[PDB]
Design a protein around this ligand. Structure first.
Ligand SMILES: O=C(O)c1cc(=O)c2ccc(Cl)cc2[nH]1
Ligand SMILES: N[C@@H](CCC(=O)O)C(=O)O
Lengths: 280, 280
């Protein structure tokens, strides 16, 4: 068939989830239908698929691939985890939906890394990302190898920095910098908006996270007081890709379509439309 | 069994210098103090193309040495005989199209791998396999220190006049890219009045206030701003893409080359090459 199950995850501006208009029960404008499984209560696992609408940069990518590669789709939001983590040797999140064949492809702010590429096939990257470091203007740090991060108890008071756990950023820090990682779990942040609030009010000195999201947040920080270090510098450069099952037949035609959007200027215009900010 | 690697002279990714009078490579050192790793690469210097052994080094050579040790293969390097990256050109009589340059050598089996700053794009990916990018790049603008250009959407570029002259290299990949985009027609028309024959000449004209802005590869331009401190890059990158290693379809090395590149991004090896060869 060419009707595909596709999974995504909310993360502005890549994927933004909205309520459907109640009278019409239709998604209009630049949005597309998506469903999210929502539990009735905490005692059992009975639940309802709620009809929502989805928009954003990755959704515009999905709409373009659907026309060019010639498929239709049932988009749903992942509810078992987030982007993807191997937990007790079992992948959850969007990666897990693809590994375990509930989804033919995962679309969103999904970072390409080595361990995920052993269990899924990724498209070419369609947006550059990596790891950036956000601080309040004036906070001085050189990069991920700053001694303040690498050996934090060499300093008094110790530098306060954290990430949002369970994604590719935390996985990367765990693999390369064991002391830094175990130190920073004290400052784990539930999500990006918690972390920005913690920075602006001096409860946190630095927030380490996906470069594409941080550079977007910096570009519309109110007051332009939050900045990424090194003028938007990206460590461990990679990209977001579409995840497909190993050996998927869609991979070649998705890759070529994404590269065609690059060569026709369409990727440039989508970045300008969704990822521009006022601050600089 | 020895992989035939083809590459091209393109600083700072691949430098090409003569051998010493005994036929060895001269001992040299990087800023960081480490010895520069050099490999012998044969190739030329309507003329006859006498192939003679030369020295090759830089970002791409460092990468090759790492991939070879990592994936356990031996290699011999030569310079592309016609000196081109690779475009499709019509054979005489309008029979078919044939790839020239590194692309033609890879497809005809004169090489097994392209290790070069080879832009990933749709036309090439139809015919060869690219790794995941080993370097994410795009276009930026080189200007005299002091000059304020926000990027490709700056009014002095969108609304051109003789008061602010900008240009690229004639018949380069950039020139071709601009010519194909209808939304850039106004910009192409101004550039074709002023395009230069080589990057070196355009960079010199920026120095001598005959060109106000040079549109080119960001990696090259950041390398240039590192050296000559009267020039800077300015504005957000645009028309982003990446360089990939090129292999033939269903080559047995494709997946492991890509995983090794992802690994080297994630463990800081690639950022270390960026520091050694691209920025200062
Ligand atoms: O891959 C291509 O076709 C191509 C064309 C260029 O002019 C060029 C210039 C500089 C660099 Cl670092 C890479 C390049 N790649
Ligand atoms: N994009 C990341 C999530 C955010 C992060 O961990 O930086 C991932 O795919 O895991």
């Amino acid at each position: 068939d060419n009707h595909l199950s596709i999974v995504t995850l909310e993360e502005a501006p890549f994927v933004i989830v909205e309520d459907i208009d109640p009278l019409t029960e239709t998604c209009v404008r630049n949005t597309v239908p998506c469903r999210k499984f929502v539990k009735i209560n905490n005692s059992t696992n009975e639940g309802m698929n709620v009809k929502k609408c989805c928009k954003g940069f990755c959704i515009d990518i999905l709409k373009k691939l659907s026309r060019t590669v010639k498929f239709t789709y049932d988009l749903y939001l992942v509810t078992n985890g987030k982007h993807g983590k191997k937990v007790n040797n079992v992948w959850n999140g969007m990666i897990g939906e693809v590994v375990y064949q509930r989804a033919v492809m995962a679309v969103g702010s999904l970072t390409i890394n080595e361990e995920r590429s052993e269990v899924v096939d990724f498209s070419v990257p369609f947006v550059e990302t990596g790891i950036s470091v956000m601080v309040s203007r004036g906070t001085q740090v050189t990069g991920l190898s700053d001694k303040k991060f690498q050996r934090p108890h060499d300093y008094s008071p110790p530098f306060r920095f954290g990430t949002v756990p369970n994604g590719s950023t935390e996985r990367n820090i765990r693999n390369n910098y064991p002391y830094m990682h175990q130190y920073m779990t004290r400052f784990n942040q539930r999500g990006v908006e918690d972390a920005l609030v913690s920075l602006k009010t001096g409860k946190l000195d630095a927030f380490i996270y996906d470069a594409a999201v941080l550079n977007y947040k910096a570009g519309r920080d109110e007051g332009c007081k939050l900045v990424t270090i090194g003028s938007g510098y990206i460590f461990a450069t990679t990209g977001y890709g579409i995840a497909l099952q190993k050996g998927s037949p869609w991979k070649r035609q998705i890759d070529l379509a994404l590269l065609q959007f690059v060569g026709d200027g369409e990727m440039e215009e989508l970045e300008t439309l969704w990822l521009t900010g006022i601050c600089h | 069994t020895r992989l035939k690697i083809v590459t091209i002279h393109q600083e700072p990714f691949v430098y090409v210098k003569p051998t010493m009078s005994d036929g060895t490579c001269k001992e040299e050192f990087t800023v960081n103090g480490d010895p520069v790793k050099k490999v012998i690469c044969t190739g030329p210097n309507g003329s006859p193309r006498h192939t003679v052994p030369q020295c090759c080094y830089g970002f791409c050579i460092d990468l090759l040495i790492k991939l070879a040790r990592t994936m356990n293969f031996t290699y011999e390097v030569h310079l592309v005989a016609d000196g081109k990256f690779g475009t499709q050109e019509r054979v005489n009589n309008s029979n078919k199209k044939e790839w020239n340059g590194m692309m033609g050598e890879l497809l005809s089996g004169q090489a097994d791998m392209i290790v070069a700053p080879l832009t990933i794009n749709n036309e090439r990916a139809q015919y060869i396999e690219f790794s995941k990018p080993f370097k994410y790049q795009g276009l930026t603008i080189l200007v005299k220190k002091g000059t304020r250009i926000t990027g490709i959407n700056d009014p002095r570029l969108r609304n051109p006049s003789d008061k602010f002259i900008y240009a690229t290299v004639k018949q380069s990949s950039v020139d071709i890219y601009f010519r194909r985009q209808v939304e850039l027609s106004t910009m192409y028309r101004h550039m074709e009045k002023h395009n230069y024959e080589s990057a070196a000449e355009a960079i010199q004209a920026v120095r001598d206030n005959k060109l106000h802005a040079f549109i080119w590869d960001s990696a090259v331009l950041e390398f240039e701003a590192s050296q000559k401190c009267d020039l800077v890059t300015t504005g957000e990158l645009f028309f982003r893409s990446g360089f990939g290693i090129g292999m033939r379809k269903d080559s047995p090395w494709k997946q492991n080359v890509s995983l090794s590149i992802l690994k080297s991004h994630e463990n800081g090896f690639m950022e270390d090459l960026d520091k050694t060869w691209v920025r200062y």
